[PDB]
Amino acid sequence: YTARLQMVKVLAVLYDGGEHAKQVPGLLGTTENELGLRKWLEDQGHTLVTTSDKDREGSTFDRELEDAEIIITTPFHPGYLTAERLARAKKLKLAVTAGIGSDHVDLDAANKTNGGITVAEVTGSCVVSVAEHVVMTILVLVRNFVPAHEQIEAGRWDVAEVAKDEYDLEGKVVGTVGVGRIGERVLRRLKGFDCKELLYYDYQPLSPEKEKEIGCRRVENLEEMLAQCDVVTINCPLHESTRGLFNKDLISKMKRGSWLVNTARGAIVVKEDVAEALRTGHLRGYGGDVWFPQPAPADHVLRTAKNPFGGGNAMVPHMSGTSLDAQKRYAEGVKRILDSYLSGRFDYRPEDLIVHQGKYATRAYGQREDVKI
Amino acid sequence: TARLQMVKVLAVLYDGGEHAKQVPGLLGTTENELGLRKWLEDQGHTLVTTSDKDREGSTFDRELEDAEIIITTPFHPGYLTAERLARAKKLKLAVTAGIGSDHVDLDAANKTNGGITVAEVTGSCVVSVAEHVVMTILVLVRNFVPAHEQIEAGRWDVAEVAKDEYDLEGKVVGTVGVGRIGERVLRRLKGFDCKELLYYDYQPLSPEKEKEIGCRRVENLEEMLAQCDVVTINCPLHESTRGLFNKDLISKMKRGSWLVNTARGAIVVKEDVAEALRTGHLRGYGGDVWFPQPAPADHVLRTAKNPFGGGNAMVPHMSGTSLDAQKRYAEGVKRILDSYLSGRFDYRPEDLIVHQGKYATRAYGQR
Numbered sequence: 001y002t003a004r005l006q007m008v009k010v011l012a013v014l015y016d017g018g019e020h021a022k023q024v025p026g027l028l029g030t031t032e033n034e035l036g037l038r039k040w041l042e043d044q045g046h047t048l049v050t051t052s053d054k055d056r057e058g059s060t061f062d063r064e065l066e067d068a069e070i071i072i073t074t075p076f077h078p079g080y081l082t083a084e085r086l087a088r089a090k091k092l093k094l095a096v097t098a099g100i101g102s103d104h105v106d107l108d109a110a111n112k113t114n115g116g117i118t119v120a121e122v123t124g125s126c127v128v129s130v131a132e133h134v135v136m137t138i139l140v141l142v143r144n145f146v147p148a149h150e151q152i153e154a155g156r157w158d159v160a161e162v163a164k165d166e167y168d169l170e171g172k173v174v175g176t177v178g179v180g181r182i183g184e185r186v187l188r189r190l191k192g193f194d195c196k197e198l199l200y201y202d203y204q205p206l207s208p209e210k211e212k213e214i215g216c217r218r219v220e221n222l223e224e225m226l227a228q229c230d231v232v233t234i235n236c237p238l239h240e241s242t243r244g245l246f247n248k249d250l251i252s253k254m255k256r257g258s259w260l261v262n263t264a265r266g267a268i269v270v271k272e273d274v275a276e277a278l279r280t281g282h283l284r285g286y287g288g289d290v291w292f293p294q295p296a297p298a299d300h301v302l303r304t305a306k307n308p309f310g311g312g313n314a315m316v317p318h319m320s321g322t323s324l325d326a327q328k329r330y331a332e333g334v335k336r337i338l339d340s341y342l343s344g345r346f347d348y349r350p351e352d353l354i355v356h357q358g359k360y361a362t363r364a365y366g367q368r369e370d371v372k373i
Numbered sequence: 374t375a376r377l378q379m380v381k382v383l384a385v386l387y388d389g390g391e392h393a394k395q396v397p398g399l400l401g402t403t404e405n406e407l408g409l410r411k412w413l414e415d416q417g418h419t420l421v422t423t424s425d426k427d428r429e430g431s432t433f434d435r436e437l438e439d440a441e442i443i444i445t446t447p448f449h450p451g452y453l454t455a456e457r458l459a460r461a462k463k464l465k466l467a468v469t470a471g472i473g474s475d476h477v478d479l480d481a482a483n484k485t486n487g488g489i490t491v492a493e494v495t496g497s498c499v500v501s502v503a504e505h506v507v508m509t510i511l512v513l514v515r516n517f518v519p520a521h522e523q524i525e526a527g528r529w530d531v532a533e534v535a536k537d538e539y540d541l542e543g544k545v546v547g548t549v550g551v552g553r554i555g556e557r558v559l560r561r562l563k564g565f566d567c568k569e570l571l572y573y574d575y576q577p578l579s580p581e582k583e584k585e586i587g588c589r590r591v592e593n594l595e596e597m598l599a600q601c602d603v604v605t606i607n608c609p610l611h612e613s614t615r616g617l618f619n620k621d622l623i624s625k626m627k628r629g630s631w632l633v634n635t636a637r638g639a640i641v642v643k644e645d646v647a648e649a650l651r652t653g654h655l656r657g658y659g660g661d662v663w664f665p666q667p668a669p670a671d672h673v674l675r676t677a678k679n680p681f682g683g684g685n686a687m688v689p690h691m692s693g694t695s696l697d698a699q700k701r702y703a704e705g706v707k708r709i710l711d712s713y714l715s716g717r718f719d720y721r722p723e724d725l726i727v728h729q730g731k732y733a734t735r736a737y738g739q740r
């Protein structure tokens with residue numbers, strides 16, 4: 001016997017589904033459907049407050065976080081837990097990410113907050129979804145789909161106009177920054193396309209057995225990998241050493257006319273340096289689903305920046321990790337993490353923990369001293 | 374062997390305009406002529422190239438009357454109708470710069486000038502297309518197009534586009550045709566962990582390839598359609614595939630399924646695809662092929678949508694004319710021309726569609 005925790009205040013910050021969340025009940029991660037948690041929490045005597053109002057001065061988020069014991073966020077509409085907000089979150093013990101990537105929490109501040117809060121996410125819930133979105137985005141860019149589709153819809157016909165930037169993925173070199181759950185799954189899906197080579201850069205390598213099974217090669221230096229690739233995909237977390245990593249200087253190490261894909265986090269790239277590299281034709285293409293901040297401001301430059309030929313943009317809202325198949329998995333995973341806390345067992349899956357008991361509980365947010373697994 | 378002399382070659386290709394000068398790799402254009410001009414002229418042959426192929430009294434219609442070799446390309450097809458073949462008094466060889474020779478009336482070709490040779494560059498485009506299929510499948514399944522439009526219009530609503538966003542993992546994909554393209558489609562889908570990979574073809578894969586790829590042969594086309602989330606069409610256009618994907622056959626697909634067609638436009642009935650999208654029987658349709666080509670400016674599949682404003686991943690006929698493919702089919706056309714002009718007639722058998730008055734392929738129907 002362990003005594004369950006009692007009358008726990010849960011705050012969820014999710015995106016509004018409006019009428020969509022009634023047309024399609026599969027939109028679990030919405031303010032309407034509340035990850036299917038409400039009855040489950042209420043039957044135990046806990047309380048749930050859900051909001052999408054998270055950015056403005058005096059937001060519902062800012063009011064409710066002051067006495068929430070558990071805060072659920074979602075990367076697709078992230079309640080930013082800044083040092084200022086954590087300092088006001090007097091009751092906070094557990095911050096759960098409905099999805100993957102907890103960089104919208106100040107993790108260093110979380111470690112110094114209320115004796116060190118637990119920051120957990122649903123590891124593996126979104127990873128296939130994102131890896132497929134990567135391969136899709138790589139092909140969309142390489143085969144110059146977007147301007148071709150626009151030509152059709154506008155009632156025009158000019159095959160040369162869009163074939164002149166159309167390549168095959170076969171015989172191209174593809175590198176991944178990060179070979180964790182997503183980066184390894186990207187390479188697994190690119191195996192069948194007979195790329196000239198599959199490269200990776202990561203301070204946590206694949207086993208030799210997995211390198212030969214997939215057919216990929218570890219590059220020890222990031223700039224040396226960029227110089228060899230036709231395609232680069234970013235699949236690492238956002239932490240101090242990856243914030244603004246893809247600046248003008250690093251992008252200039254990519255090949256002229258290369259393709260860049262970023263489904264990881266917006267703030268890993270410098271948005272003005274991506275736009276200038278596309279506009280001068282150093283990049284042929286940029287695409288992905290992640291932005292900083294989110295929601296992306298209406299005038300964000302990567303909404304509309306193009307290569308010199310009028311193509312090269314394959315951006316979408318932050319959706320790959322919130323496909324209807326991913327939402328079923330991270331909704332179930334959030335309930336599992338909540339049960340670990342509310343039971344008083346604190347029997348978390350170790351791979352779900354980002355920070356815990358005042359220390360980083362992961363090796364994936366930078367190379368660290370003081371990592372306790 | 375005595376070489377043939379002073380041969381009149383006619384090429385019907387697409388115009389590259391300024392594009393074919395920005396990008397010299399656009400070989401399959403009227404500007405760059407597949408890199409053939411000097412090669413032909415140094416042998417004493419002549420080349421006439423045009424993109425003018427549709428109107429009454431077109432350059433094509435004038436020049437085909439005494440052309441001995443006609444080069445066409447599927448991306449801008451000189452239609453060799455029975456009427457035109459009847460006037461092509463000197464025609465001996467029709468070469469397709471790419472793959473798919475259905476723009477030639479092959480039955481008429483067999484009865485023309487003692488049976489003309491119709492050859493194409495087998496294998497030149499097949500990876501290109503297979504990549505384009507998987508791309509199109511992901512674009513539809515993941516609801517990319519309206520999501521990209523939302524971003525470019527300065528809007529932000531994740532639910533609006535996530536409500537029709539699925540993963541390809543755990544879906545059933547079926548190919549109509551498991552030849553060079555359909556087999557390469559399944560080889561690219563293997564790493565996505567689909568629930569099952571199916572095929573329908575009267576020429577099966579070997580057991581060893583079924584086990585290696587991890588796919589299953591379905592004996593009946595309608596029974597395969599009933600089991601699939603996604604359907605891709607990878608067969609040639611011939612009498613038994615023309616209008617195959619009509620309302621009755623599409624109604625055997627699952628409600629909310631996705632249909633890809635990189636094969637040939639005329640294999641689908643365009644009004645029946647548009648109606649199935651309109652009512653939500655299909656979630657999506659996409660591909661690069663149309664009938665006729667150029668696609669009329671009002672073709673219904675330019676603008677047909679699902680009930681949510683998505684589900685259209687159409688492009689012009691480009692997948693087989695990627696810059697990597699053009700290098701391969703340009704080299705292949707030169708090889709086929711050398712077989713004829715040398716007087717050896719030593720064609721690769723797999724390049725032959727009709728020859729010596731007979732079909733030379735099993736892939737244009739069971740004969």
Ligand SMILES: NC(=O)C1=CN([C@@H]2O[C@H](COP(=O)(O)OP(=O)(O)OC[C@H]3O[C@@H](n4cnc5c(N)ncnc54)[C@H](O)[C@@H]3O)[C@@H](O)[C@H]2O)C=CC1
Nearest residue numbers: 100101126178180181182201202204236237263264321364
């Ligand atoms: N677009 C979307 O919806 C989603 C995006 N994400 C993002 O993807 C990131 C990675 O996800 P997973 O692969 O599941 O996590 P993971 O923890 O399994 O793998 C990440 C890898 O990145 C490596 N890494 C860290 N810093 C790096 C550096 N400077 N250079 C190279 N590699 C570095 C780590 O060592 C680790 O092997 C997430 O942290 C999140 O930011 C994940 C899921 C949803």
Ligand SMILES: NC(=O)C1=CN([C@@H]2O[C@H](COP(=O)(O)OP(=O)(O)OC[C@H]3O[C@@H](n4cnc5c(N)ncnc54)[C@H](O)[C@@H]3O)[C@@H](O)[C@H]2O)C=CC1
Nearest residue numbers: 472473498550552553554573574576608609635636693736
């Ligand atoms: N979008 C593009 O740029 C391109 C499109 N294509 C088209 O795709 C077609 C196929 O290309 P490949 O795979 O290289 O040809 P292939 O000849 O290697 O294979 C075609 C397969 O279709 C099968 N087939 C014929 N009728 C069928 C039916 N009713 N049902 C099921 N399967 C049937 C054949 O038995 C054969 O196995 C070409 O004939 C051409 O129309 C190919 C290249 C370029």
